[PDB]
Design an enzyme around this catalytic site. Structure first.
Site, short mmCIF file in Angstrom:
data_model
loop_
_atom_site.label_atom_id
_atom_site.label_comp_id
_atom_site.label_asym_id
_atom_site.label_seq_id
_atom_site.Cartn_x
_atom_site.Cartn_y
_atom_site.Cartn_z
CG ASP A 25 -6.35 -0.53 -1.20
OD1 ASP A 25 -5.94 0.62 -1.08
OD2 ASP A 25 -6.43 -1.16 -2.27
CB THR A 26 -6.60 3.95 3.25
OG1 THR A 26 -5.24 4.15 2.83
CG2 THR A 26 -6.59 3.32 4.64
N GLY A 27 -6.78 3.45 -0.09
CA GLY A 27 -6.96 4.03 -1.40
C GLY A 27 -8.04 3.41 -2.25
#
Ligand SMILES: CCC(CC)CN(C[C@@H](O)[C@H](Cc1ccccc1)NC(=O)O[C@H]1CO[C@H]2OCC[C@H]21)S(=O)(=O)c1ccc2c(c1)CC[C@@H]2O
Lengths: 99, 99
Positions: A25-27
């Site tokens: 999850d890069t967010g």
């Protein structure tokens, strides 16, 4: 690996000796896992997402292997909708975005 | 390009004739953008994450440009604290995770 995004980037992780599935999850700044048992001490912490803030158990300096790549860092444990691996550990395994 | 994850993967996007800042977010199935009075029809939706759910307006076939890469797909508009480009559009600009 190179991971395309037509499907959820789900991978197997090893934490506390147990295997689990987690979302890359890069967010997410932080790594947040659903309720589980983890050894050692922990500190109450608050984290906020799209819908507000939740209480979590903060475990520091935890060994976690992600798709065959070892990391040692902070793992938050609490009522997240899904296990997510956040940037604090994605950087450790050398994960980048590319296009 | 290649984007490291030491800091939030924020990029400039163009949507509805406006420039905004948004996260390249592999953890988001779809794209969610701050309140903006877009023209056209929409359908209500509820989306959940850490902290609970928010109410959003689903717009379909919306044109977005991401770092010069054009894409077109669903955009969810509502009181999100952060603009996130989700997998529905990241796939269209050729974005992958790599480690
Ligand atoms: C479901 C997994 C994941 C939530 C764990 C889904 N999120 C995406 C994830 O990247 C969010 C993005 C974000 C939201 C607010 C502020 C900053 C960043 N980050 C996150 O919460 O990170 C936590 C832990 O680290 C901290 O850093 C940032 C915040 C803290 S979402 O935003 O809630 C979402 C998006 C589209 C859509 C849905 C749900 C449903 C359908 C639609 O497609």
């Amino acid at each position: 690996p190179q991971i395309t995004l037509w499907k959820r980037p789900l991978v197997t992780i090893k934490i506390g000796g147990q295997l689990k599935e987690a979302l890359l999850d890069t967010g997410a700044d932080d790594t947040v896992l659903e309720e589980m048992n983890l050894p050692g001490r922990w500190k109450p912490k608050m984290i906020g997402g799209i819908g507000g803030f939740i209480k979590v158990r903060q475990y520091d300096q935890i060994l976690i292997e992600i798709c065959g790549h070892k990391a040692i860092g902070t793992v938050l444990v609490g009522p997240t909708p899904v296990n997510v691996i956040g940037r604090n550990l994605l950087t450790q395994i050398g994960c980048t975005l590319n296009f």
